RNA sequence: GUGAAGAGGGAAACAACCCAGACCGCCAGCUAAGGUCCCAAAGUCAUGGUUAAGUGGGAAACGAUGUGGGAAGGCCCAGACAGCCAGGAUGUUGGCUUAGAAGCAGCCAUCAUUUAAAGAAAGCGUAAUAGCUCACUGGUCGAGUCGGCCUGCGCGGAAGAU
RNA sequence: GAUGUCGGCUCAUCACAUCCUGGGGCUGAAGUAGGUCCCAAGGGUAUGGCUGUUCGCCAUUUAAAGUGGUACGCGAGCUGG
């Protein structure tokens, strides 16, 4: 699992292992895991902007009184 | 499968502490002796270790023999201690311990900084003779294994650090 | 090691053992037998 | 492995184990000092004819002290003398360089009797048959 | 040597034989003498792993069906085009 | 079933000779070592002793199908069994012939005419006076009991009454 | 047959494929092929078997002590299987070859002998002799194991202009 | 009712089946060196001549003188042999 991209430069694919992506900047494994689950352009941007992950275990969301949900 | 059927019957005075799947073997004359059984479920009884299938795996007897082997090796490590005297052939190489550190030369311009895991201790009578002491059968060979990283018994003239069983065997040119 | 395909028994101690999805010939007579893949 | 074997093999002429080449390398390789063996073999060789190579089978302890059985000359030396042959054919069965009767064979077999383990003087004879066969003597009834 | 069983054929035709082979059963007949051929169904892997010994064919067979026993020896074998598996075997009274 | 008869036959074969033996002797080696065994077969044909080397699986199944005397505790661990139905002293002599290039503590026990003979005692049976020397010790024993003991006691009560 | 002379459903969709043959309208309902975690309409479906490869969900030659089940069968506590240890002998360091030439440098013999027992040797090995594992024998050893065959599942072979 | 060419220059780009350093197995490899040999697309990757020349030959550099594709890349960039 190496998260394939070609943003625009240099011969080759460029890559990053799932482990680098969870150990450093940990948001992104789960971020580009839900990305492909939402439709096309406009509706898929509109569904996405409601979510936040931050880095992990550093949340600021005490004051709203969050409703717990188990998966 | 016959060595998965061995009831072990652990010795008197070895402390085998069971958290269900995690087992910690303690006693005198070594440190840091443990197993995480993850493929197989291990019940202790009072001392008769019994091996069977774990949730989310399908292979059988295959790690149950390993559990037997690995738990009993550990038990045997704390009781008598498995042989401790290790040694190397080839002039000018060495493995002289000075404290927690193993001093050797490889012609390198840096200090090699080869050092012991926390799960072993060592001392040396002579610069080519090393005695590693502990009660985990895996660790004593894991530091040997790193010592061997660039000093394997060579396949021609055989020089290297020599210990226990090793799967390079040495070979000859065709017979004279 | 040479990469190859299909593993055969070169000497009476070629055990032949499956490490990952590739079968290694590992022998304990001669170091000469290490075919990496099967 | 102790690296111990009973009945390690040697063949050296009864007056020539004073030099090392007639003993060859093997003895040295299992660590029996050649002079010490030479003195001990000389004490037991006087009823044996000199220069006839005697097989001697040694059993060895840990500390490399050694014990030795000395034997009457090979069935192959005796068979060469009795057939009027210097040497064997160098091919078994196909090549003939002579012939042997049973009565010359039963006496070769008694000359080995105290070394031969067999329970019958016929079994002992039977054992030396394939030694005549190898050297191009036909064993005739 | 072998003591086996058989059933008499419920269904005949091509359409009928193929639903037995879907179920890992196969057919037979015992011919010879003055008397009729007894058409029968067998179980496939009952005789496949017997016929691993050469004794299924070298020695006669006890085949009991509706309590009738006549004694029999194997005859010529029909096998599937590209599998050794038995499509049909013939038998003669012995 | 077995592929061969050798393992099942030998159980019957060992019980047969070993009830019958007037002496047999059960001794230890786990690899009897060839120089000595062949030297014990060489001599064995002089003396008329027979020797089999035999597994504790066979010896246990033998005790189970057939009753044995005074050897069936010495079958435990690695075992040779040498046995004689004739000249019982010679069976025991064979162990002093094996003791010469090898160890004498290896006997666990023996039986001799239904008697248990313990490991230490059998070195004495193997000493084996000849018939003239046997008659002569039977006389020393009777001349001892006759006149030697007689004076031995009367001196020992005379010393004791004499007071200091 | 379908398109040509056809809507609508599914397929990453096309001209032809699988369903099917658009009268128009109805915030009606069912069923088809094709679907049923999100994308996206419905099953993270229940029951039993099985696998470590994202195999599944990309193809052949070919091969192997990768992995499981099965019935029929040999071995199968009278002790397997074969690991671990220990013996591995008597003529014999057989003949030739050689300083020695020893099962294993090369070649021919390829056996016989006391044996409860050890091939004049399968494989290794100072290049060779020496030592070594190996059945078989005797300690440990007290249960599965192997050939045939049916069968679920795996493997590498399968490296490219973006 | 048209994607318009070779050789060369300019400017590049992507596949690794890597020209090379680098890590490492085998070797009938003593060590060195080579043969054998797996990983790897990151970076650097020479120049004058003759011919219309792809291809050729020669002189020379470089530790070294690579492999493949782009309307036979690239005239809504350059030539008219």
């Amino acid at each position: 699992k190496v998260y394939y991209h070609h943003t625009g430069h240099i011969g080759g694919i460029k890559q990053a292992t799932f482990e680098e992506m969870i150990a450093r900047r940990p948001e992104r494994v789960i971020e580009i895991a839900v990305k492909g689950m939402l439709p096309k352009g406009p509706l898929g941007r509109a569904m996405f902007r409601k979510l936040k992950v931050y880095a992990g275990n550093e949340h600021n969301h005490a004051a709203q009184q969050p409703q717990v949900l188990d998966i | 499968s016959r060595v998965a059927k061995a009831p072990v019957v652990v010795p008197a005075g070895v402390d085998v502490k069971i958290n269900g799947q995690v087992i910690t073997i303690k006693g005198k004359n070594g440190e840091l002796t443990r197993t995480l059984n993850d493929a197989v479920e291990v019940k202790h009884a009072d001392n008769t270790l019994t091996f069977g299938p774990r949730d989310g795996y399908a292979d059988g007897w295959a790690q149950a023999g390993t559990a037997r082997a690995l738990l009993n090796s550990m038990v045997i490590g704390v009781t008598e201690g498995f042989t401790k005297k290790l040694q190397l052939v080839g002039v000018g190489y060495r493995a002289a311990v000075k404290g927690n550190v193993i001093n050797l030369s490889l012609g390198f311009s840096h200090p090699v900084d080869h050092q012991l895991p926390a799960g072993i201790t060592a001392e040396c009578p002579t610069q080519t003779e090393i005695v590693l002491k502990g009660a985990d059968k895996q660790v004593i060979g894991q530091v040997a294994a790193d010592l061997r990283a660039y000093r394997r018994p060579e396949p021609y003239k055989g020089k290297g650090v020599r210990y226990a069983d090793e799967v390079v065997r040495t070979k000859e040119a065709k017979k004279k | 090691m040479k990469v190859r395909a299909s593993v055969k028994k070169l000497c009476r101690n070629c055990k032949i053992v499956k490490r990952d999805g590739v079968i290694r010939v590992i022998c304990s007579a001669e170091p000469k037998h290490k075919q990496r893949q099967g | 492995a102790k690296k111990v074997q009973a009945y390690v093999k040697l063949q050296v002429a009864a007056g020539m184990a004073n030099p090392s080449p007639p003993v060859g390398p093997a003895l040295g390789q299992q660590g029996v000092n050649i002079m010490e063996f030479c003195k001990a073999f000389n004490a037991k060789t006087d009823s044996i004819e000199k220069g006839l190579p005697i097989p001697v089978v040694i059993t060895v302890y840990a500390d490399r002290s050694f014990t030795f059985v000395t034997k009457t000359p090979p069935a192959a030396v005796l068979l060469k003398k009795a057939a009027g042959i210097k040497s064997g054919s160098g091919k078994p069965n196909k090549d003939k360089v002579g012939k042997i009767s049973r009565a010359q064979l039963q006496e070769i077999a008694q000359t080995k009797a105290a070394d031969m383990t067999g329970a019958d003087i016929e079994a002992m004879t039977r054992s030396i048959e394939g030694t005549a066969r190898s050297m191009g003597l036909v064993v005739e009834d | 040597m072998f003591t086996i069983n058989a059933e008499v054929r419920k269904e005949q035709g091509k359409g009928a034989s193929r639903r037995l082979r879907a179920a890992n059963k196969f057919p037979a007949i015992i011919y010879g003498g003055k008397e009729a051929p007894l058409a029968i169904e067998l179980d496939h892997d009952k005789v496949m792993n017997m016929q691993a010994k050469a004794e299924f064919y070298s020695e006669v067979l006890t085949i009991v069906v509706d309590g009738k026993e006549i004694k029999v020896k194997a005859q010529d074998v029909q096998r599937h085009p590209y599998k050794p598996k038995l499509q049909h075997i013939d038998f003669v009274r012995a | 079933a077995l592929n061969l008869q050798d393992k099942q036959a030998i159980v019957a074969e060992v019980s047969e000779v070993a009830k019958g033996a007037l002496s047999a002797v059960v001794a230890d080696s786990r690899g009897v070592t060839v120089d000595k065994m062949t030297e014990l077969r060489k001599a064995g044909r002089e003396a008329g002793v027979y020797m089999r080397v035999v597994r504790n699986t066979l010896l246990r199944r033998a005790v189970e199908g057939t009753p044995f005397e005074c050897l069936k505790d010495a079958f435990v661990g690695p075992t040779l069994i040498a046995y004689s139905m004739e000249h019982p002293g010679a069976a025991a002599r064979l162990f002093k012939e094996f003791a010469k290039a090898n160890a004498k503590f290896e006997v666990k026990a023996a039986a001799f005419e239904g008697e248990l003979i313990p490991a230490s005692q059998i070195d004495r049976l193997a000493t084996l006076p000849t018939y003239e020397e046997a008659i002569a010790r039977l006389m020393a024993t009777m001349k001892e009991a006759s006149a030697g003991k007689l004076v031995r006691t009367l001196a020992a009560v005379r010393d004791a009454k004499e007071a200091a």
Side-chain angles (χ1 to χ4, degrees):
Chain A
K1 187 171 197 161
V2 307
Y3 292 93
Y4 326 87
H5 79 97
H6 195 89
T7 286
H9 326 245
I10 298 304
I13 53 164
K14 311 277 188 177
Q15 64 176 303
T17 194
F18 178 87
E19 304 188 78
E20 287 318 288
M21 300 175 77
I22 201 177
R24 320 181 177 187
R25 202 305 151 281
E27 190 225 79
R28 61 213 176 183
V29 300
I30 176 65
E31 202 89 319
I32 329 295
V34 302
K35 199 70 233 76
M37 301 198 185
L38 308 173
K40 62 179 190 184
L43 183 69
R45 307 191 300 101
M47 269 170 194
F48 185 66
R49 69 165 276 200
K50 296 195 284 286
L51 164 62
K52 48 238 65 186
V53 178
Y54 281 64
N57 270 118
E58 65 180 51
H59 86 127
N60 57 25
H61 318 78
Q64 57 187 20
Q65 289 1 91
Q67 274 86 333
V68 75
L69 187 60
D70 181 61
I71 315 296
Chain B
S1 202
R2 173 276 171 245
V3 278
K5 278 263 284 198
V8 187
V9 190
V10 181
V14 176
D15 169 40
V16 169
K17 314 193 74 168
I18 185 164
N19 306 109
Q21 304 321 140
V22 184
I23 298 171
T24 313
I25 305 87
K26 281 290 179 298
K28 63 305 176 170
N29 196 255
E31 61 296 91
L32 193 58
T33 301
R34 38 59 48 212
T35 292
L36 294 56
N37 303 285
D38 300 274
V40 286
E41 193 302 290
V42 182
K43 164 171 48 67
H44 187 25
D46 209 322
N47 286 121
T48 299
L49 284 171
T50 300
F51 312 108
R54 195 62 182 95
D55 309 303
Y57 279 74
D59 70 83
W61 87 86
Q63 273 96 102
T66 304
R68 193 284 314 165
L70 182 65
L71 289 173
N72 191 1
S73 54
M74 291 182 177
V75 153
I76 294 175
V78 296
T79 292
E80 193 49 64
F82 41 71
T83 186
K84 289 196 190 62
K85 202 175 305 190
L86 266 73
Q87 66 274 105
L88 78 94
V89 182
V91 179
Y93 292 161
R94 312 177 288 109
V97 191
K98 295 171 181 181
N100 74 314
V101 190
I102 299 192
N103 188 92
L104 67 160
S105 50
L106 289 164
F108 290 144
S109 252
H110 48 242
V112 283
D113 295 300
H114 197 294
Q115 81 74 53
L116 301 168
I120 203 72
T121 330
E123 66 288 325
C124 64
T126 40
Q127 320 286 273
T128 52
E129 195 160 281
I130 54 195
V131 180
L132 304 93
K133 49 167 272 300
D136 200 340
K137 202 65 174 78
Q138 305 182 304
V139 176
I140 180 165
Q142 281 159 24
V143 65
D146 185 22
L147 187 56
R148 188 173 167 194
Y150 306 143
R151 317 193 297 88
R152 183 203 75 211
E154 71 199 80
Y156 221 122
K157 308 302 180 158
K159 313 183 290 286
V161 50
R162 274 289 168 164
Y163 68 99
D165 289 82
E166 311 187 279
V167 66
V168 66
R169 199 48 62 156
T170 315
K171 61 94 198 69
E172 36 56 78
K174 71 283 179 162
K175 310 198 185 81
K176 274 56 190 167
Chain C
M1 300 209 217
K2 57 280 127 184
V3 45
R4 295 302 208 166
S6 169
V7 285
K8 305 281 307 278
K9 179 179 178 71
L10 302 169
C11 180
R12 192 203 69 99
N13 307 96
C14 293
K15 284 166 290 192
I16 315 193
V17 183
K18 194 187 182 172
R19 73 176 176 71
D20 316 280
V22 293
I23 304 149
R24 174 186 68 155
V25 169
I26 178 64
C27 190
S28 204
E30 292 125 312
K32 210 169 89 86
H33 306 145
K34 297 164 196 221
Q35 299 169 89
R36 181 179 70 174
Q37 302 180 2
Chain D
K2 296 187 308 185
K3 299 193 175 196
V4 160
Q5 176 165 99
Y7 290 142
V8 163
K9 57 169 86 302
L10 180 58
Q11 182 162 110
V12 55
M16 318 176 161
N18 178 257
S20 275
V23 183
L27 188 77
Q29 291 169 252
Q30 193 74 350
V32 174
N33 178 262
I34 276 165
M35 188 76 237
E36 208 177 26
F37 164 71
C38 182
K39 301 184 180 196
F41 179 32
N42 292 345
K44 204 167 164 164
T45 45
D46 45 51
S47 49
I48 264 68
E49 179 178 85
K50 302 304 200 184
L52 284 193
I54 296 316
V56 33
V57 287
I58 287 174
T59 301
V60 52
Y61 296 101
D63 56 323
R64 296 307 171 169
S65 71
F66 66 96
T67 60
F68 68 108
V69 160
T70 314
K71 303 189 273 187
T72 36
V77 155
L78 306 177
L79 271 167
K80 276 166 177 171
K81 270 181 190 186
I85 77 163
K86 283 201 185 165
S87 275
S89 56
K91 295 291 162 267
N93 315 283
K94 301 168 286 302
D95 288 69
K96 188 182 178 180
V97 280
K99 255 190 184 313
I100 205 73
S101 80
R102 288 286 184 145
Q104 187 65 21
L105 201 76
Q106 182 265 359
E107 186 52 59
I108 292 179
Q110 285 278 22
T111 312
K112 292 302 296 196
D115 328 293
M116 283 254 49
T117 198
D120 199 15
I121 285 57
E122 287 277 39
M124 296 177 170
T125 313
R126 198 167 162 86
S127 200
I128 65 162
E129 173 267 272
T131 323
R133 166 189 74 208
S134 282
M135 79 218 309
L137 311 190
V138 192
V139 185
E140 185 67 50
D141 298 92
Chain E
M1 182 285 183
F2 294 114
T3 286
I4 65 165
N5 71 80
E7 156 77 61
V8 295
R9 287 297 299 274
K10 289 188 298 275
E11 69 292 281
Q12 296 185 340
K14 184 161 190 189
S17 188
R18 286 166 49 93
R19 55 185 184 259
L20 296 171
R21 309 200 190 101
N24 310 293
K25 283 187 60 59
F26 91 105
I29 21 165
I30 298 161
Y31 57 73
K34 305 279 74 165
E35 61 184 83
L38 311 167
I40 55 175
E41 69 195 89
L42 298 175
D43 298 293
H44 178 259
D45 280 281
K46 198 183 52 62
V47 290
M48 189 71 284
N49 306 124
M50 281 189 196
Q51 281 163 15
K53 286 51 64 45
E55 298 292 87
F56 192 94
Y57 319 96
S58 179
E59 297 278 271
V60 290
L61 303 168
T62 297
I63 318 193
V64 64
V65 52
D66 308 278
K68 191 176 178 165
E69 182 67 81
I70 58 274
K71 281 71 174 68
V72 310
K73 180 173 167 58
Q75 304 291 101
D76 57 301
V77 184
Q78 193 190 23
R79 305 185 180 220
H80 292 104
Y82 77 80
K83 293 181 295 162
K85 290 181 70 176
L86 265 66
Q87 195 159 35
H88 187 81
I89 196 169
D90 293 279
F91 298 106
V92 86
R93 295 182 161 89
Chain F
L2 295 86
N3 177 26
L4 296 316
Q5 184 58 16
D6 185 80
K7 286 291 191 172
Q8 191 168 64
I10 195 183
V11 176
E13 293 186 71
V14 74
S15 189
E16 168 64 62
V17 295
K19 295 174 83 168
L22 300 183
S23 171
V25 189
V26 188
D28 195 299
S29 212
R30 53 176 308 285
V32 88
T33 308
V34 298
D35 168 67
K36 305 85 194 169
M37 193 99 283
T38 289
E39 154 186 58
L40 204 86
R41 297 170 281 188
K42 254 192 293 305
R45 294 169 307 108
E46 300 292 81
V49 192
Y50 319 123
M51 172 279 302
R52 282 177 189 231
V53 196
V54 182
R55 237 181 178 96
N56 194 30
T57 60
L58 275 22
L59 290 169
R60 284 187 259 97
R61 187 76 166 84
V63 173
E64 189 180 76
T66 53
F68 284 70
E69 72 300 283
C70 306
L71 314 145
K72 71 283 205 294
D73 53 88
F75 295 168
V76 174
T79 301
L80 52 137
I81 182 185
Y83 55 82
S84 297
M85 288 65 72
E86 66 297 283
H87 205 316
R93 201 179 67 98
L94 202 78
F95 201 72
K96 201 75 286 313
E97 278 169 315
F98 196 53
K100 281 169 103 185
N102 203 250
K104 57 186 317 169
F105 65 91
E106 303 289 282
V107 38
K108 275 159 290 172
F112 180 93
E113 312 196 262
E115 315 166 288
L116 164 67
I117 295 297
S120 79
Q121 191 160 299
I122 194 56
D123 306 319
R124 314 192 196 138
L125 270 69
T127 299
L128 189 70
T130 79
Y131 321 77
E132 180 62 62
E133 221 312 90
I135 285 167
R137 179 266 308 265
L138 287 162
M139 288 299 155
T141 297
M142 298 165 199
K143 277 177 195 182
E144 184 65 61
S146 176
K149 182 149 51 182
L150 185 53
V151 295
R152 175 160 68 244
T153 61
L154 264 159
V157 79
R158 173 184 300 136
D159 195 81
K161 295 183 142 178
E162 282 179 65

